[PDB]
Amino acid sequence: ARKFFVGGNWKCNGTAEEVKKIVNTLNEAQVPSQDVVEVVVSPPYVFLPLVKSTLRSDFFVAAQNCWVKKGGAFTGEVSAEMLVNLDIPWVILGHSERRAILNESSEFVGDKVAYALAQGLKVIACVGETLEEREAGSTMDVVAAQTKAIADRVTNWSNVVIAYEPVWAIGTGKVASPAQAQEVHDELRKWLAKNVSADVAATTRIIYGGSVNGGNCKELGGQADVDGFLVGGASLKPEFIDIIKAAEVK
Amino acid sequence: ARKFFVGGNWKCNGTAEEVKKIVNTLNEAQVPSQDVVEVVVSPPYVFLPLVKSTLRSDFFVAAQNCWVKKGGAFTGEVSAEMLVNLDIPWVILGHSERRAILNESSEFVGDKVAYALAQGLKVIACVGETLEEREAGSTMDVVAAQTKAIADRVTNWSNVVIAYEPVWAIGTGKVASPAQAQEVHDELRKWLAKNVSADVAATTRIIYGGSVNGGNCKELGGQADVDGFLVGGASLKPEFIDIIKAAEVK
């Protein structure tokens, strides 16, 4: 059975004082065991040392990005081997904001995933379609294309978690229903089964990366092919603890 | 008189063990006073806390990049206000590797410089032309266009240092002479005098960001319009100390 997975993407947010308050609140939380839910917290690069040194040892830390290949003359970038050196176990790759605002292509994302895995990182790999793409009836064409670019470069999926982001509902005034989330997760898992292997489809966590909050987390998490969440803004808030506790619905 | 300035850009390099060795070596160095030379060291984001906590207090730390505007939903990016919060005083912006590989436009760089200054950072702003551009006779056309994009957005130059990168000599098999460096620095300073102000031209450090090592630092540093260096690979090596010591040539 797939272990429920809850990741918290802090995005480009944080100060030393706020990080201290967030971590203290997480440290005082009483949540399901590590056998029931896998919890990953992702601060900006410059707060990885502070968070890794002060966060409860049963929660894990992720970087929000890394470079596509070995380090060297790439001013401003952080290599996967640096993260491994600092004992940062996870990385988020292919987030919708990086695909859209920083123009990361599906192929670029796939090369990053492959390189990160080869260095020993575990990866939250993000996919998702825009409002224009959904309206065009292209949701699964887009999500499959993004996933295929990764699948073409990755032979071993053990340390991958896929995050589906309904970008079409992100600040579009559209809201995503639990039924809509389940439809995409189900079709994506079917795609993995048909295009990678039955074993990979059965064992790979596919987590929901749309709007998740204390109010809707149990309803989303109870969906058959939803294995957890990649949380945005709520991950900065005490409400993240309630989202972790949604693992009990499984 | 303009204070000599030596920045060390570590680029995408470093491990905890190597950082400890580099910092120990700098900490044991005996170099000209803080009144004679201003020294800035720039590690990858994830080593900014380690370096800030262990480096001698009379040397300063820089980030290698920051985001173009206020933080928020920009997964993977580090905002200028984060760096200020962590007491990181400097940032490198517009480095040739980010212009070329990550496609940062001159306008994007200009906006970053303005935002960083607005938040209280000091900025090393990088400009420079390619081999194709130099061979076409466009060196000063290009450097002026890049500088204009920054100047059009900057209201106060006190906390700006300009770095000229002879990109045309970077892995092209061409070598830049000290005379060639001095020509560009002189023409760039004259451009500042005519198009910003005589005071800004007289007071703004323009540092050389081509190949600098122990062997050539004195000849370069002695040029009338060269105010120091943005060092690449030598910045990881004990030789960085000899480059700092070139300040004595002024």
Author numbering:
A (entry chain B), B (entry chain A): 2 to 251
Q: What do the authors of the reporting publication say about this deposited model?
A:
Triosephosphate isomerase (TPI) interconverts glyceraldehyde 3-phosphate (G3P) and dihydroxyacetone phosphate (DHAP). One or various cytoplasmic and chloroplast TPIs (cTPI and pdTPI), are present in plant genomes. cTPIs are involved in glycolysis, whereas chloroplast enzymes participate in the Calvin-Benson cycle. The three-dimensional structures of AtTPIs confirm that both enzymes assembled as dimers with asymmetric units containing two monomers that fold into a canonical (β-α)8 or TIM-barrel. In conclusion, our data indicate that the duplicated TPI gene from A. thaliana has suffered two evolutionary fates: the cTPI isoform is susceptible to redox agents, whereas the pdTPI isoform is resistant.
